[PDB]
Design a binder for this molecule. Sequence first.
Ligand SMILES: Cc1nc(N(C)C(=O)Cc2ccc(-c3ccccn3)cc2)sc1S(N)(=O)=O
Lengths: 384, 448
Amino acid sequence: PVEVTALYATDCVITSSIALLTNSAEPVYIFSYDAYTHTPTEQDRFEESRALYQASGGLNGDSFRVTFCLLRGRTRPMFVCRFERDDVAALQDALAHGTPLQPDHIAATLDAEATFALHANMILALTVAINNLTTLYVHHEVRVLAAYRRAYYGSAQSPFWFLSKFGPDEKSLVLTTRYYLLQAQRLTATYDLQAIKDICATYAIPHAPRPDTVSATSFAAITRFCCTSQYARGAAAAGFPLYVERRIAADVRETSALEKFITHDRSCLRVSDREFITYIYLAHFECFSPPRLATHLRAVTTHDPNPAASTEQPSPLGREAVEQFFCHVVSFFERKASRNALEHFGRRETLTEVLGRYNPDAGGTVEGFASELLGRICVSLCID
Amino acid sequence: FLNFTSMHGVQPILKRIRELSQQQLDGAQVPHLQWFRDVAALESPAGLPLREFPFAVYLITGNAGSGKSTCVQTIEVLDCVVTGATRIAAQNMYAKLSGAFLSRPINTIFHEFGFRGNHVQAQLGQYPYTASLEQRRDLTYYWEVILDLTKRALAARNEFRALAALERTLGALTRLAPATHGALPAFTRSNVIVIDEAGLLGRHLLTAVVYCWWMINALYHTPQYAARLRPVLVCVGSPTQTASENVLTYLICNRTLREYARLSYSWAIFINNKRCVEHEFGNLMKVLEYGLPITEEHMQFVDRITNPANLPGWTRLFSHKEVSAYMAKLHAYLKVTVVFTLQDQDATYVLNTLMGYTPYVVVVNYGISSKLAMTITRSQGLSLDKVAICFTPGNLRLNSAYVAMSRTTSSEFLRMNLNPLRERHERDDVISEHILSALRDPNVVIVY
Ligand SMILES: Cc1nc(N(C)C(=O)Cc2ccc(-c3ccccn3)cc2)sc1S(N)(=O)=O
C-alpha cells in the first residue's frame, strides 16, 4: 500500500466534484501528486523516497490509496479512491503520462466509506441551514454549490494561476507546487511560498533539455507539462524536501548565530544615539550584505540531490564576524561605516576635485547664476 | 532571490503570534453577552461600568519601503483577517497579497467592525471624561458609533448555537458555520486581525475594534468565543511617518497599554529601506525619524515651484487652499498653451487616464483623482515619484518634512522651496525616543 495525495483539477471543479460524488462529471487532471509509504536517517529517507518513484515506473507499488484534494491548511481532501484492480494502470498513466482520469474509473474506484466520512459534517451543516446521502444537490442546489465554494477556497482557479503563482520554470512548477501544497503539511517548513521558490532556485541540480521544447494554454497540457518532467520522478523529487530542511537548517544556524551577537551588543552598548543607529545599521550591513548573502547562498547550493554527495559546503556567513565583531570593549562605528560606504556606494570625490575643475570665486560664474535671479526673485536658503 | 533573506527573521514573528492566539482566557474574565445588553439600553455614556475587554497585540512598525508588507504576505500560514485602515490600504494589500497566493477581498476595518453610512456624519467626543485598562474613555469618545452599532447588531443569532446543539446531541459542526452561511462577519472566524497602516486610525478605534469583535463573537456564540479565545490585533504601520493620537502611538506610549500588551516581548521593527539607493538621502531619512541630532553636515545635502511653468509631471505638495490656487492657475494658463480644460479639488479637468469625455469621462458619476496637487497630510501612504514640496514657514514641523521628502524613490526627483532643516522647525521627539529605546531592548525582534 502506497498512499498518494493527488491535487486534481477540472476544465468549476466544485460542480464536477459534487456531481461525481452524486453518481450523476468531467475528466480530471492530476496536476501534482504526492507519494508516501506509511512508516530514519536522511540517507534512508532519500533511498526510500527514490525507490518509491522510479526512472521507468511511475510509482513502485501494487496497491494505492489516492486522496484527491483541492485548494493553516492550503489543500483539503475531497474524495479517497482505491486502486487494487488493473484500473491501477489508469492511475499509472495519469501519474506518469498525465492522461486524464475518466469519471468511470473514479466511480469504479471511489471508496465510499472514506469519501463520505469526511463529508458527513458538511451535509449536516447544509441540512441545518435548510432546516432554519449527499444528494441535496438535486433540490436546494445553488446553496450546496455556494457552500462548497466557500469550503474549498480557491479550488476554482485558472491554469494561468498555477503557471504564474507557482513558477515560470519546470523545476519551480513541479517541485514547489508539490512541496508547498502537499509535503509541507504532510511532513519544519511553515514558510511562505516565495521562501520555497527561493529554496527551489538554490536546488541547482542537473537540468535536461526538453525532448519536446514547449511551454504554454488552458487546463489540458500543464498536467502533461509536469508529470513527464524529469524533476517529478527520481533523485530530484526524492531529495527536494530533505534539501529544503537542510537549507533552512544552515540558514537558520547562521542567521540566529548573528542575531545573538547583534542582540547582545545592542542591549549592552552604553552609547550615544547617533552611534547607536550607526552601529545597528553597520552590524546589519556587515552581516547580511548582498555580497555576503550571495556567498552564503552559493555555499548552501547543492548540485546532486543525493544527500550522500552534498556538494553544499560549510558556509562562511557567520565566521565573517571577524571583520566587524571587534567589539570587545572619531569612533570606530563611524570609520567602519565610511570604509565600508566607500566600497558599496562609491567614491564621493571631494570639493577640491571640482575646485580644480574651476581651477567661481574668481571665475566669473559666481555672478553667473547667483546674480542671475532670472525672475525667480544652491538658491533660496537661510530646493534639493 | 537575494532580497528575501529577511524571511528567516519573519518566522519568530509568527511563532509569537501563534503563541499569542493559542492562549485561552479564564472563564471569569471572558466577556458575557449581557455586557453588550444595557449598553444598548444606556442613554448616555455616563452609566458605563468599568469592564475590561481583553485583547492581545503584536505590533509592526518600520519606515515605508521597509518590507512591512512581507509579514502580511507571510501571515497566510496563519488563519487571519487581514484588513486595512483606508480603502487605498485595503486595495494595496489585496494586490500585494493576491499577487503571491490566494486572498479573499480585503476590506477596511470599517467594513468589519460594522461601520456603515450613518456613522461618518456623527460628531464625536462631546461627552466628558476624567490609569487602568478598565477603554471606558475610548467608548465614551466614540459613543455615537458604538451605540448605533450595538443597537443595530442586537436588533438583527442562532447560526452557530444550532450546530453546537446538534453536536451536543452527538466541537466540529460549529467550525463549518462560516462555510454554510455567507453573511457572518470575518470577526466571527478568527481572532487574528491584521490592520495595515494603523497610524491612519484614531487611538479610540483600537478599543472599538476589540469591543465589536467581542460583541460579534458573543451575539453569535462563535466557537472561538466558546474557546475563551481573545482578540489578537497585528497592527502593521509606520508610527513616525503616519499621524490626535495614533493607534500605533497609543500602543507605544501609554504605559498601561504598553505593559498589558507586553510589547517588548511582542514587537518587531523593520529597519531597512529597499527603496532609496543613495547613501546621503538614507542617512538623512535615518536621522529624521530616529530623532538623531541635526548637523550642518546633514545640511549642505538638503541644500543640494509655485509657477506652473517648468516641472511637468511633478506633484506639488502644499495648506489646503494653496493646492486650490495652484491647480486653478494651472488650468487658467493652460488655456493659452496636450491638454484642455472642461469635489475634493477646486473649480474643470485637465486632459493629462483622464483624457476622454462624453458623461462617462475617461466611470459612472464625476468625482475623480488628479495626482497633480495634493496636500502633505494626504500625501501620506501614497508613494510617488514626482515630488516638489512647498513648505510654508511659521508652521513647519519635521514630521511634515520627513513625510514630504519620503514619498519618492530617489532624491534625483526631489525639489522643494525652503530648507526645512534650516528654518524654525518643531521637534516631536517623543515617538523617536520610544522607538529608539525599543531598538535597544533585547526582547524586541528587529528585521533588516
Ligand atoms: C553602506 C550602507 N548601506 C546601508 N543601507 C543599505 C541602508 O541604510 C538601507 C536603508 C536606507 C534607508 C532607511 C530608512 C530609515 C528610516 C527611514 C527611511 N528609510 C533604511 C535602510 S547601511 C550602510 S553602512 N555605511 O552603515 O555600512
